[PDB]
């Protein structure tokens, strides 16, 4: 608990020690932190906690460092959107430990009727996860993934791979559902995670390949194409396909 | 009026007895001749919210016309919500019906296998996102509605394996403005009204 | 396949997931005189010329594909404009 | 009971799975559920946590015990 001076170590790490680590970082030292992991070891060694990305955005003048942090805040928000969707779908069926939303939904008996492989609630999994229904439907979707699963006659996959690629294509693509994700879900989830309000986060003012490598390390999944591969493709609604995964 | 919550059943009460007509006379008395309580506004709002007709509420709002000289926000906001809930209940109905028909097909594979192996063995307003709508909420899920509705057009003709505009071939005609949402064009209707029977 | 002959859809998301293309085109023949006439008055309107008269046409899209494009346009909350381009 | 080809590539999938499982990783491992009344609950923090004991099921160096 903060006694009387822990609010001063808090009150300096957000106001002056933060603005000092920013002041070193806007001067462009030789070999400024390049990827996300060198950037995180930069702020951690200086003592500033990483969950103050909102304050570090508000304290910077340079349009470069605005973009560097905009890579970082989106990368960790999509990391948590990846995590809680996986958790809310695994622990949702009926038994033992399950999520709070799975227990709360007493409805859906008013629509399905008994006149079977269906375990009733198994038909409408779009409501168990913690997102609005319009965003959620493309998070669990398979229609733009038929051609690739046709062609693979050796490599198996999982449903975790599918919900992965639904999340990567709704952030990186020329899809209109991708524009929907950045305007109503990814922007609002940044505001309640890292104090970065929805106005500053925009899909246009972010670099498509650097945000992609930032998800390569935060989300914990590695893909066969690299950052330069996405730049050298035609824009597409779901440009990333199951065969683009390795392990 | 019945359930309510604590603190002299929520709408503020008084001396025991006090029949609800003169009790409501007290309730309008505190609001105008002001000596009221913080839960007294929730009285007249919760009563007006369930008792007036939509026309009576619209007259109540229209007494404010010095401010808000504009009109018809109420039918506009009702039509957005009516469009949203009608779009929502159809999209879930198409999504559930797609998933029963597809898993019916997997059972259809399974039954033809178990006979094949056997044969070889024998041998009122509720604002959610319709207000301040500029993030294009319609594009995400109406796209799913169009895809899923005609997905059932595919799935129906898989079951059967197991002409609304150009009807003059039948002998009916090609009524102008006969797109699938509408039944009569604007010029065609107004010809039916005055210029004929 | 015995699956009719071009009367259902294209499945724009499901058939070309990596490519951003409209659809594959068909051929058909426009010999209906009322459709041939309405296309003629379209080109007459676009050119200010009461001398242009149509000789034929070829609908390179199924009528089911025209309906799918109409519903996608209303899903985008935007209208449909006809663009008369030279080949 | 699903197709024969996908039965034999699922059988091939579980066939290649122990090859990944052994050699460099330990040659498969046995798990103890270790119920939530053990005096290892001091190592536990939250009441919905799940602890798992891990015995090597190999020649090892008789150390194991993660």
């Amino acid at each position: 608990f903060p006694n009387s001076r822990a609010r001063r170590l808090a009150g300096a790490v957000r106001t002056e020690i933060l603005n000092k680590a920013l002041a070193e970082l806007e001067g462009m030292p030789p070999f400024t932190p390049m990827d996300s992991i060198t950037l995180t070891h930069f702020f951690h060694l200086r003592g500033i906690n990483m969950r103050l990305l909102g304050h570090m955005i508000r304290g910077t003048r340079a349009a470069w460092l605005q973009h560097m942090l905009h890579v970082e805040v989106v990368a960790r928000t999509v990391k948590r959107i990846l995590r809680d969707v996986l958790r809310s779908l695994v622990f949702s069926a009926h038994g033992y430990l399950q999520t709070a939303r799975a227990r709360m939904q007493r409805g859906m008996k008013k629509l399905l009727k008994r006149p079977p492989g269906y375990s009733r609630e198994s038909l409408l999994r779009e409501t168990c996860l913690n997102a609005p229904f319009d965003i959620a439907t493309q998070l669990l979707d398979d229609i733009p993934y038929l051609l690739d699963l046709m062609s693979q006659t050796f490599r198996h996959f999982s449903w975790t791979d599918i919900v992965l690629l639904n999340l990567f294509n709704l952030t990186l693509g020329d899809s209109s559902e991708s524009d929907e994700f950045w305007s109503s879900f990814l922007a609002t989830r940044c505001s309640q995670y890292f104090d970065v309000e929805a106005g500053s986060i925009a899909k246009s003012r972010i670099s498509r390949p650097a945000l992609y490598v930032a998800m390569q390390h935060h989300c914990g999944i590695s893909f066969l194409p690299d950052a330069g591969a996405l730049n050298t493709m035609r824009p597409s609604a779901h440009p990333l396909q199951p065969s683009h995964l390795r392990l | 009026f019945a359930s309510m919550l604590e603190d002299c059943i929520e709408d503020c009460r008084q001396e025991p007895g006090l029949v609800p007509a003169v009790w409501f006379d007290r309730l309008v008395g505190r609001i105008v001749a002001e000596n009221g309580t913080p839960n007294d506004l929730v009285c007249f709002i919760s009563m007006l919210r369930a008792f007036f007709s939509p026309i009576q509420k619209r007259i109540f709002l229209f007494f404010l016309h010095e401010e808000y000289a504009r009109t018809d926000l109420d039918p506009s906001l009702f039509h957005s919500h009516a469009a949203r809930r009608e779009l929502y209940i159809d999209t879930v109905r198409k999504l559930i019906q797609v998933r029963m028909n597809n898993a019916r097909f997997r059972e259809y594979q399974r039954l033809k296998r178990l006979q094949e192996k056997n044969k070889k063995d024998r041998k009122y307003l509720d604002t959610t996102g319709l207000i301040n709508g500029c993030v294009w909420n319609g594009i995400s899920l109406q796209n799913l509605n169009v895809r899923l509705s005609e997905q059932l057009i595919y799935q129906d003709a898989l079951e059967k394996e197991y002409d609304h505009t150009d009807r003059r071939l039948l002998g009916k005609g090609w009524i102008s403005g006969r797109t699938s949402t509408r039944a009569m064009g604007r010029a065609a209707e107004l010809s039916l009204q005055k210029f004929g029977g | 396949r015995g699956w009719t002959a071009g009367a259902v859809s294209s499945f724009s998301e499901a058939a070309h997931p990596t490519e951003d293309r409209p659809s594959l085109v068909n051929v058909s023949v426009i010999e209906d005189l009322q459709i041939l006439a309405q296309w003629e008055y379209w080109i007459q309107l676009s050119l200010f010329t009461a001398d242009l008269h149509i000789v034929g046409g070829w609908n390179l899209a199924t009528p089911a594909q025209q309906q799918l494009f109409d519903a996608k346009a209303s899903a985008l909350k935007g209208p449909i404009v006809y663009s008369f381009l030279d080949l | 009971f699903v197709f024969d080809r996908v039965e034999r590539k699922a059988r091939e999938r579980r066939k290649s799975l122990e090859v990944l499982k052994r050699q460099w990783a330990g040659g498969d491992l046995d798990l103890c559920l270790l119920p939530d009344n053990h005096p290892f609950n001091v190592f536990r923090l939250f009441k919905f946590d799940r602890m798992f004991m891990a015995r090597s099921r190999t020649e090892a160096s008789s150390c194991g015990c993660q």
Binding site: L146, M150 | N102, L158, E161 | G6, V27 | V2
Partner: peptide
């Protein structure tokens, strides 16, 4: 070997049972 009625087909895809490969057939015709 891609011919016949599309209900049953045969399992060629990695987990798709076979009746979703009509959901990828654009109607090629002339």
């Amino acid at each position: 070997g891609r011919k016949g009625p599309p209900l049953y087909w045969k399992q060629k895809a990695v987990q798709v049972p076979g009746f979703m490969e009509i959901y990828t057939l654009e109607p090629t015709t002339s």
